[PDB]
Amino acid sequence: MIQRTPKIQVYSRHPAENGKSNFLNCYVSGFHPSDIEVDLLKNGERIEKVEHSDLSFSKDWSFYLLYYTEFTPTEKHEYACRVNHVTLSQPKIVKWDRDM
């Protein structure tokens, strides 16, 4: 058996086709087993509509998840990713660093 803690990155991207739109992304990488819970948060509250969740694996024991949705960020709110996994004793909350 193998278990590996997810690496978690939170970042924003504008699709080059439409620069006015903005996507909030949570890239959860290199984890095993594949069982996982991932949410995007706004002010600590779960964002219900996340239009994209893309799961893949490399080797049989390494999973990759890109979880993202359109948003219009303001300075008034805090955005984050919350991840639960068997390797994590408590939920991991990673705040969006707005430089990325």
Author numbering: 0 to 99
Q: What's in the article?
A:
A recent case of systemic amyloidosis involves the highly unstable D76N mutation of beta-2 microglobulin (β2m). Indeed, the 76 position is located in a solvent exposed loop between β-strands E and F. A detailed analysis of the interaction energies of the ensembles reveals that D76 is at the center of a network of stabilizing electrostatic interactions that are lost in the D76N mutant.
While D76K resulted too unstable to be purified, the other three variants were structurally and biophysically characterized. The crystal structures of D76A, D76E, and D76H were determined to high resolution. Analogously to the structure of D76N2, these structures do not show any major conformational change compared to wt β2m. However, although the backbone of the EF loop is well superimposable between the structures of wt β2m and the mutants, changing the residue in position 76 alters the H-bond network within the loop, in particular in D76A and D76E. The side chain of Arg97 presents different conformations, and the strength of its interactions with the EF loop and to Trp95 varies in different mutants; residue Met99 interacts with Ser11 or with Arg12. Similarly to the D76N mutant, all three mutants display a decreased stability and increased aggregation propensity, confirming the key role played by position 76 in determining β2m biophysical properties.
